[PDB]
Amino acid sequence: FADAQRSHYTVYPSLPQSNKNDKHIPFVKLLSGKESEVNVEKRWELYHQLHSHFHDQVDHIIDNIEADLKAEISDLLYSETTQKRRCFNTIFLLGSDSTTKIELKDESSRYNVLIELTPKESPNVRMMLRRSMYKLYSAADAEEHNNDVSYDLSLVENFKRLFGKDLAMVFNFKDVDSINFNTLDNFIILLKSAFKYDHVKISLIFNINTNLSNIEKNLRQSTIRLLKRNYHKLDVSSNKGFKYGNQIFQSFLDTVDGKLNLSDRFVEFILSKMANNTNHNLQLLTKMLDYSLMSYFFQNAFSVFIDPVNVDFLNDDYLKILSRCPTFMFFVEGLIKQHAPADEILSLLTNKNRGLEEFFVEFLVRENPINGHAKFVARFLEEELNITNFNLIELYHNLLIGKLDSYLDRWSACKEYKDRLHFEPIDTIFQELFTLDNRSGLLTQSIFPSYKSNIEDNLLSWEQVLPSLDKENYDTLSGDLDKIMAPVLGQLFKLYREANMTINIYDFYIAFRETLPKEEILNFIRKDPSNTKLLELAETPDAFDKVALILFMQAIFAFENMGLIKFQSTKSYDLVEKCVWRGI
Amino acid sequence: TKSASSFLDTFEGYFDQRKIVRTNAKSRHTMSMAPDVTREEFSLVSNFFNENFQKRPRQKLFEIQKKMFPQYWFELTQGFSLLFYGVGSKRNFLEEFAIDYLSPKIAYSQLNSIPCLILNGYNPSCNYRDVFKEITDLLVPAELTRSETKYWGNHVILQIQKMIDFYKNQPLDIKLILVVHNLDGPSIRKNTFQTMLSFLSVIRQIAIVASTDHIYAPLLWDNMKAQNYNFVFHDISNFEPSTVESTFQDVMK
Amino acid sequence: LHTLKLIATTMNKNIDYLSPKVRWKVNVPWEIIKEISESVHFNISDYFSDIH
Amino acid sequence: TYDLSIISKYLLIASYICSYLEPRYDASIFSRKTRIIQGRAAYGRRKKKEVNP
Amino acid sequence: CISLGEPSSIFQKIFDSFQDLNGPTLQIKNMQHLQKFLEPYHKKTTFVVVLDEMDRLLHANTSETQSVRTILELFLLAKLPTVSFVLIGMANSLDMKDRFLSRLNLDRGLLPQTIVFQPYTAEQMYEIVIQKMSSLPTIIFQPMAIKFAAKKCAGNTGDLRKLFDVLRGSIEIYELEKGKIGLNYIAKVFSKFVNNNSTRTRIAKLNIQQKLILCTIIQSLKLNSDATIDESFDHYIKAITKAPLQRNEFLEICTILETCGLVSIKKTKCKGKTKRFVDKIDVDLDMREFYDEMTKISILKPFL
DNA sequence: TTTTACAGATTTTATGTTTAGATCTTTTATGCTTGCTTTTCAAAAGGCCT
DNA sequence: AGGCCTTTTGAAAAGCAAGCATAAAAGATCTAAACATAAAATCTGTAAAA
């Protein structure tokens, strides 16, 4: 109708008043629909306890990097002078994204203002000056507890006699790699004349997200020699000095200490996806670990057994599920192959439910500390050895594999400690229902998918998305069409893939016209009982082409706004250009 | 047959099919010799073939992916945004998911319903100032004061930043479900709209349920946009005939 | 990379990225590309060997 | 040199390559896989141009 | 729809019905705030307004943005209770009728009826205006002259207000003697606007120096389209180089060709290389009758 | 008890300031066509060999 | 009497390069919308005097 013709129509969905059930949580009935409702409620509450215990530590680390950074910047912003006294202090914040709040100290009988500047707040030099002096007059006349001045450096000249305090303005350029440096060095030149006023103290703070050889290549050399008077650098990045990856991954183990385990493939996938992204890694760490936890409690019924009170709700289907673990198969093969007691394996094979039901609850008192010993290796490398360039994720990966000694000899600094820093752990039976893992490609398919490859796969093959049927063909309208005829927009792509770079739309139409059935669609087209217009065009002696051009032009103008087809030669639109290739 | 390509589609399929073809080997055939139709014959056979070619397999597919809905509600209520890419129209999926399923389940669980702001982003008349006008009466936030507004700044982006720092001291319940159809459409792929919709997804109290159509879509979002969205991607390609949106675009002869 | 002004394009005002008429170009010089190809250890000196 | 990722460094290198190389001479420098169908690769440039692009 | 200009003040002027206290604030946002005012508190009553000259409002915002948007917005007839709030449209001349779009043309409200109202047989119309009389006639207008007037008006579009200022002028030129005289006006205003293409062209020029210069502008068109008066004067000393003459004589004799109504000299962009203003030359009539005008002058034949 | 009448608040009108996006023109850039030429390969001409 | 295999080998496919065209970049010039200020008429709310 006409409601999908206007943008942003808000819609209130009306609702039935109540259904009076427990359907207030999304956790479905697992074990092919055999689970109890109280176990689903306990699973939801247990997942929320785990998720809250994780994120209450993640938030303290994330709100502690700001209390570390404000402590860092505000120490080399102050407590130092230069003998020239006609220079501005300059701090290059390397690798920093513009997300930090800066605090300026008391320093009484002197104002301290912070003038944040942006590539949107700087289209030329005069808007920078008007915004800077506007922020100066605002943060000077509102921090005092009346005339109108002009917003230029004259306010900086007579700031001493307008207010009575000395000025100390601290500039702050947010995306220094995104401003014009031609506007920025003009602003620095325009600021340089403020030196002669004896009550100012300009400080510049550059938030650079690239290296320093790309800022002093684009600036002019006189501005660079002015900036070489009192400059300091400061590396602000959460990959330098692995302290905040060794506090998010450390805190993830404090929630899963004994209840859950991590796989080998999972930690190497974490390391592969944390290394292909540098700007934000404290967020791509947490949104992989939480989505690993969310795909666990939604899938694994045995999560209800990670609390040692729910041990008595072992139904028959839990005993069916746990029995077909291959580590238990390895254990039972062990009980066969070393010695032969008959009537114990005959019990625990398929008959006795009580022995297997009480046997599994012994397997939860075990700890086998991977994450209980890895903190000892972390404390040994940080305190006793004083090496602060190690990664807890990669050390944990090698400790999980077992080649930890190679990673400890990667430094060649702890040769007398390769026995003290050694730990060879084994597997405990029934790990493979209690492990966070990725062997199905779930964290790949729904966090970092091959987007274009999935679109092209669904366009080309299309049988992995559309079903085939064997009963619903006679009550339908097209029963014999789903088996002999590919879907248009999925059939045209088979000709689009094996075409050239320049595709003539008439040849692209003829190749589509002779891959359709002729003697089927001329029978099919007369099926409709209601309308009468669709049958008279079948009484026309050129029905097949006039039904073929409709489907072809529909598929072409459907590909075009998807991105696979560029119509070159405007005012012709006859020779299209293939512009997406499969497999790339 | 009409392509002499040694390789097919990889990087060497790109390098191989980009050759140079002579003037006599070319086929300069205008599409005038295609048998012309009327507008109403197209309009008739189109709506016939939409719901009468693969109708029961597509309904079977929608019932297959319709038991996926509790995972979508779980991912929304745990903080993520959703992104539904795929072949075909994702329109009726989000009209049958967000209106029917989602907001009744959200409204019951925190105990009228939860307001659903649909946003037809395939319409090129999609300004962000009237869309943010439509957001600021479904939430009604505070106004921009004199100290918090700046010298000729953007009031929409500053208001969303003020809402972001307001909603860190609040209970975490969904207050709106923002349903964007064709998020990479011709008037919403631009930068300030995406800055708006990326700063809205920072708020936990609004669930973004987006959909894309173009294939080079993920390069609209850098390390700041793709971090404030924190999308989870779901290929729900269901081969829909996509006839709500094609009335907007040119169907010129 | 487009945000960090390292690859760049024809700056029409608020250009759409998803058009088949917007083409891209690098605007970093050779002297940093040699250091980059030294960092990942990529032999790029023999890619422009057939020009000088 | 730069605090970038591996794929971003290779994207910078590949964008540096394709915006200084002529588009016709890349199937002589990168095409390496065995054919199954009768095809010919790019021959490459005959004379090295010493204008230094 | 006069004092609107922008799509901003559509709804306040129709609000003098009960002269309410509300009207400025609640109404001008939304269609549901005018759906709030469609139900009638004071009985069924009636209030149908006729917004006049409605094509004048929708001619803004330069693509569709807030005017054509408003025409696809204010033709919704969605809810139909017992409420008399219809609005017939008063569209102007056919300037942007044949430009449409599918939102304007697909089943919402008062669209699919439009009629050309051209008054053919306006002779009977004049007969109705004169027979509906308050001042008895003796000698009526001759219907041969009435049909000649109705013939010589309705060829362009068929304006009736144009024809109403013709018979009035005919009896106004009748009163200047103190169908035989209701014809020289049209034979007067057709000839006055036309003047003479070639018969009076040289007649008014009578001067040869006011004749061959028009040929200089004719030769200054099929070499250059930026015909500067300098270029009209560099062509002048590429033709007569075979009492001096300065540029002032040329540019003041061009005022005669300006005064008659052939030539246009004003400042234009002057594209060229630099973009500052200079004088131009342009001619209007087609070179068919002027090429027959030179068939009598033996010196304007080699210059063609 | 209304109707006035000062105070203050909100509207009206009018012009100033900054940002974002359109049209049109000039100058360089890219692709198309036509004749000639230089590579790689695949059919083959023919000697070696079972 | 037969398969093979390496020098030689057409030869049709890549490469090259002047000649007109036409898209496309870059910028000049313009304009509309968001954004801000402000004085005077106008609305209105609280006592206003009868």
Side-chain angles (χ1 to χ4, degrees), chain A residues 177-179 209-210 213-214 217 565-566, chain C residues 3-6 20-21 28-29 31-32:
Chain A
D177 211 288
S178 282
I179 322 179
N209 221 52
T210 54
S213 78
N214 208 32
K217 180 172 253 159
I565 282 294
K566 173 190 171 167
Chain C
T3 289
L4 281 180
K5 296 175 168 45
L6 300 186
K21 277 188 294 288
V28 80
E31 316 285 34
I32 315 176

mmCIF file of all heavy atoms in Angstrom, chain A residues 177-179 209-210 213-214 217 565-566, chain C residues 3-6 20-21 28-29 31-32:
data_model
loop_
_atom_site.group_PDB
_atom_site.id
_atom_site.type_symbol
_atom_site.label_atom_id
_atom_site.label_comp_id
_atom_site.label_asym_id
_atom_site.label_seq_id
_atom_site.Cartn_x
_atom_site.Cartn_y
_atom_site.Cartn_z
ATOM 1 N N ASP A 177 45.517 13.784 11.994
ATOM 2 C CA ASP A 177 45.688 13.227 10.668
ATOM 3 C C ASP A 177 44.534 13.586 9.733
ATOM 4 O O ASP A 177 44.659 13.395 8.521
ATOM 5 C CB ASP A 177 45.858 11.712 10.784
ATOM 6 C CG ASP A 177 46.729 11.141 9.691
ATOM 7 O OD1 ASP A 177 46.283 11.083 8.535
ATOM 8 O OD2 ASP A 177 47.877 10.760 9.992
ATOM 9 N N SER A 178 43.437 14.142 10.248
ATOM 10 C CA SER A 178 42.295 14.481 9.408
ATOM 11 C C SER A 178 42.109 15.976 9.177
ATOM 12 O O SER A 178 41.317 16.350 8.306
ATOM 13 C CB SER A 178 41.006 13.914 10.005
ATOM 14 O OG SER A 178 40.879 12.529 9.740
ATOM 15 N N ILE A 179 42.785 16.848 9.926
ATOM 16 C CA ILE A 179 42.766 18.269 9.593
ATOM 17 C C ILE A 179 43.692 18.495 8.409
ATOM 18 O O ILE A 179 44.626 17.715 8.191
ATOM 19 C CB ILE A 179 43.192 19.122 10.801
ATOM 20 C CG1 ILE A 179 42.657 18.545 12.104
ATOM 21 C CG2 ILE A 179 42.689 20.551 10.673
ATOM 22 C CD1 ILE A 179 43.052 19.326 13.338
ATOM 23 N N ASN A 209 46.828 9.553 14.933
ATOM 24 C CA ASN A 209 46.546 8.135 14.796
ATOM 25 C C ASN A 209 47.474 7.431 13.820
ATOM 26 O O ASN A 209 47.229 6.266 13.492
ATOM 27 C CB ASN A 209 45.094 7.918 14.360
ATOM 28 C CG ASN A 209 44.439 6.760 15.081
ATOM 29 O OD1 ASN A 209 44.454 6.689 16.310
ATOM 30 N ND2 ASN A 209 43.863 5.839 14.319
ATOM 31 N N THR A 210 48.512 8.104 13.340
ATOM 32 C CA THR A 210 49.563 7.525 12.513
ATOM 33 C C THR A 210 50.922 7.855 13.131
ATOM 34 O O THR A 210 51.019 8.260 14.290
ATOM 35 C CB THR A 210 49.471 8.013 11.062
ATOM 36 O OG1 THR A 210 49.465 9.444 11.025
ATOM 37 C CG2 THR A 210 48.236 7.478 10.371
ATOM 38 N N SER A 213 56.379 10.590 11.251
ATOM 39 C CA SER A 213 56.989 10.910 9.966
ATOM 40 C C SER A 213 55.967 11.322 8.915
ATOM 41 O O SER A 213 56.351 11.652 7.791
ATOM 42 C CB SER A 213 57.797 9.715 9.453
ATOM 43 O OG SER A 213 56.947 8.724 8.900
ATOM 44 N N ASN A 214 54.683 11.296 9.248
ATOM 45 C CA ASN A 214 53.640 11.761 8.358
ATOM 46 C C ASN A 214 53.027 13.075 8.812
ATOM 47 O O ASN A 214 52.106 13.572 8.155
ATOM 48 C CB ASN A 214 52.538 10.697 8.228
ATOM 49 C CG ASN A 214 51.806 10.764 6.901
ATOM 50 O OD1 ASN A 214 52.382 11.119 5.874
ATOM 51 N ND2 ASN A 214 50.525 10.432 6.924
ATOM 52 N N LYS A 217 56.232 15.579 7.684
ATOM 53 C CA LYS A 217 56.415 15.637 6.244
ATOM 54 C C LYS A 217 55.459 16.624 5.602
ATOM 55 O O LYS A 217 55.820 17.301 4.636
ATOM 56 C CB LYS A 217 56.216 14.249 5.632
ATOM 57 C CG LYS A 217 56.377 14.170 4.123
ATOM 58 C CD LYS A 217 56.345 12.732 3.645
ATOM 59 C CE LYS A 217 57.715 12.256 3.231
ATOM 60 N NZ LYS A 217 57.776 10.781 3.263
ATOM 61 N N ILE A 565 26.417 -4.592 -11.436
ATOM 62 C CA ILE A 565 26.293 -4.150 -12.817
ATOM 63 C C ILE A 565 26.414 -2.635 -12.860
ATOM 64 O O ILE A 565 25.719 -1.924 -12.129
ATOM 65 C CB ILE A 565 24.957 -4.624 -13.428
ATOM 66 C CG1 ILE A 565 25.046 -6.093 -13.820
ATOM 67 C CG2 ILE A 565 24.576 -3.805 -14.640
ATOM 68 C CD1 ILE A 565 26.014 -6.356 -14.933
ATOM 69 N N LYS A 566 27.313 -2.139 -13.701
ATOM 70 C CA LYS A 566 27.407 -0.716 -13.974
ATOM 71 C C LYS A 566 26.964 -0.441 -15.402
ATOM 72 O O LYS A 566 27.537 -0.976 -16.356
ATOM 73 C CB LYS A 566 28.826 -0.192 -13.770
ATOM 74 C CG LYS A 566 28.975 1.251 -14.215
ATOM 75 C CD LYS A 566 30.416 1.699 -14.252
ATOM 76 C CE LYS A 566 30.534 3.065 -14.909
ATOM 77 N NZ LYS A 566 31.872 3.677 -14.691
ATOM 78 N N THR C 3 39.898 6.811 5.875
ATOM 79 C CA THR C 3 39.708 7.780 6.948
ATOM 80 C C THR C 3 41.026 8.442 7.324
ATOM 81 O O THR C 3 41.087 9.665 7.494
ATOM 82 C CB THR C 3 39.067 7.089 8.152
ATOM 83 O OG1 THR C 3 37.703 6.786 7.842
ATOM 84 C CG2 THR C 3 39.110 7.965 9.399
ATOM 85 N N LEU C 4 42.106 7.665 7.382
ATOM 86 C CA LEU C 4 43.424 8.178 7.738
ATOM 87 C C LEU C 4 44.120 8.915 6.605
ATOM 88 O O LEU C 4 45.320 9.169 6.728
ATOM 89 C CB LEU C 4 44.328 7.036 8.193
ATOM 90 C CG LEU C 4 44.167 6.489 9.599
ATOM 91 C CD1 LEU C 4 45.168 5.382 9.808
ATOM 92 C CD2 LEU C 4 44.371 7.592 10.602
ATOM 93 N N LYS C 5 43.410 9.210 5.510
ATOM 94 C CA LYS C 5 43.911 9.965 4.358
ATOM 95 C C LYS C 5 45.166 9.341 3.757
ATOM 96 O O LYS C 5 46.114 10.040 3.402
ATOM 97 C CB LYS C 5 44.155 11.428 4.722
ATOM 98 C CG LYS C 5 42.905 12.191 5.105
ATOM 99 C CD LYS C 5 43.257 13.590 5.562
ATOM 100 C CE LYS C 5 42.031 14.462 5.667
ATOM 101 N NZ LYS C 5 40.922 13.759 6.351
ATOM 102 N N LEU C 6 45.187 8.014 3.669
ATOM 103 C CA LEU C 6 46.312 7.318 3.064
ATOM 104 C C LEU C 6 46.003 6.811 1.669
ATOM 105 O O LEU C 6 46.792 7.046 0.751
ATOM 106 C CB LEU C 6 46.758 6.157 3.953
ATOM 107 C CG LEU C 6 47.202 6.595 5.347
ATOM 108 C CD1 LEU C 6 47.758 5.426 6.110
ATOM 109 C CD2 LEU C 6 48.229 7.698 5.274
ATOM 110 N N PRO C 20 29.595 3.100 -8.765
ATOM 111 C CA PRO C 20 30.580 2.674 -9.757
ATOM 112 C C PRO C 20 31.107 3.834 -10.586
ATOM 113 O O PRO C 20 31.363 3.681 -11.782
ATOM 114 C CB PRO C 20 29.781 1.688 -10.608
ATOM 115 C CG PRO C 20 28.397 2.245 -10.577
ATOM 116 C CD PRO C 20 28.218 2.952 -9.266
ATOM 117 N N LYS C 21 31.317 4.986 -9.951
ATOM 118 C CA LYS C 21 31.888 6.149 -10.614
ATOM 119 C C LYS C 21 32.809 6.910 -9.675
ATOM 120 O O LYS C 21 33.258 8.009 -10.015
ATOM 121 C CB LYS C 21 30.794 7.080 -11.144
ATOM 122 C CG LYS C 21 30.235 6.680 -12.497
ATOM 123 C CD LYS C 21 29.303 7.731 -13.040
ATOM 124 C CE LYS C 21 28.068 7.853 -12.180
ATOM 125 N NZ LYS C 21 27.170 6.682 -12.354
ATOM 126 N N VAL C 28 50.072 8.601 -0.271
ATOM 127 C CA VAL C 28 51.275 8.487 0.541
ATOM 128 C C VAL C 28 52.454 8.389 -0.422
ATOM 129 O O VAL C 28 52.283 7.902 -1.542
ATOM 130 C CB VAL C 28 51.222 7.289 1.512
ATOM 131 C CG1 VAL C 28 51.540 5.964 0.859
ATOM 132 C CG2 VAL C 28 52.082 7.512 2.748
ATOM 133 N N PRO C 29 53.626 8.967 -0.101
ATOM 134 C CA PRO C 29 54.754 8.907 -1.048
ATOM 135 C C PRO C 29 55.518 7.591 -1.042
ATOM 136 O O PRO C 29 55.205 6.692 -0.258
ATOM 137 C CB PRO C 29 55.652 10.064 -0.596
ATOM 138 C CG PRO C 29 55.201 10.401 0.759
ATOM 139 C CD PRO C 29 53.766 10.098 0.829
ATOM 140 N N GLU C 31 58.596 7.027 -0.130
ATOM 141 C CA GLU C 31 59.587 6.903 0.927
ATOM 142 C C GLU C 31 59.040 6.262 2.191
ATOM 143 O O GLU C 31 59.829 5.842 3.041
ATOM 144 C CB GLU C 31 60.163 8.282 1.246
ATOM 145 C CG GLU C 31 60.520 9.171 0.024
ATOM 146 C CD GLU C 31 61.796 8.785 -0.751
ATOM 147 O OE1 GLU C 31 62.155 7.594 -0.870
ATOM 148 O OE2 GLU C 31 62.465 9.714 -1.249
ATOM 149 N N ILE C 32 57.722 6.170 2.330
ATOM 150 C CA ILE C 32 57.090 5.445 3.419
ATOM 151 C C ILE C 32 56.638 4.056 2.978
ATOM 152 O O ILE C 32 56.607 3.122 3.782
ATOM 153 C CB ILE C 32 55.917 6.267 3.990
ATOM 154 C CG1 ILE C 32 56.355 7.721 4.158
ATOM 155 C CG2 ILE C 32 55.474 5.731 5.333
ATOM 156 C CD1 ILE C 32 55.274 8.656 4.624
#
